[PDB]
Amino acid sequence: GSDLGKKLLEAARAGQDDEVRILMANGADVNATDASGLTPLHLAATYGHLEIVEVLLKHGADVNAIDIMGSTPLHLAALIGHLEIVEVLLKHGADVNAVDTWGDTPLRLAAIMGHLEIVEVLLKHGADVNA
């Protein structure tokens, strides 16, 4: 039979907000992970799907879920450059100073990418310049 968690990951990545809600109401685990540890929240945060990020969080998504590389959804939003998603993640308790496998924080990632508005937001939320 079909895997609801795999469908939830695909709906979160595709930006299908109606399907995300339906899947979860029918038993899809909000914290379903693929082979690399990516959750629906990691995918919605990467693809810039703000409403899906908010829906996932309201349904109990782990805001600080880490994949095999230690990337939290905040790392992914800061790297790509989704400002409103960074702000929503921080509001829901994202670890501003989370360090991935390469020793990078969301602040480092936003800085190297030249995402200055995100840099300022992270710093205002307690990003440690020495982490």
Residue numbers in the entry: 11 to 141
Tell me what the authors wrote about this structure, in their words:
We next determined the structure of a high-affinity DARPin (namely the TM-3 triple mutant), not bound to tubulin. These data should allow us to establish whether the evolved DARPins adopt in solution the conformation of tubulin-bound D1. The longer side chain of the Arginine residue at position 118 in TM-3 compared to that of a Histidine in D1 led to an interference with the C-cap, hence to the destabilization of this module in TM-3, making it mobile and thus invisible in the X-ray structure. However, the comparison with the structure of D1 also indicated that the C-cap would clash with neighboring molecules in the TM-3 crystal if it were folded as in D1, leaving the possibility that different conformations of TM-3 coexist in solution but that only the one with a destabilized (mobile) C-cap is compatible with this crystal packing.
This strategy led to evolved DARPins that bind tubulin two orders of magnitude stronger than the parental one, resulting in complexes with subnanomolar dissociation constant. Biochemical and structural characterizations demonstrated that the affinity increase is coupled with the destabilization of the ankyrin C-terminal capping motif (C-cap) of the DARPin, which in the parent DARPin interacts with tubulin but needs to undergo a rotation to avoid a clash. This remarkable order-to-disorder transition illustrates a new mechanism for affinity maturation.
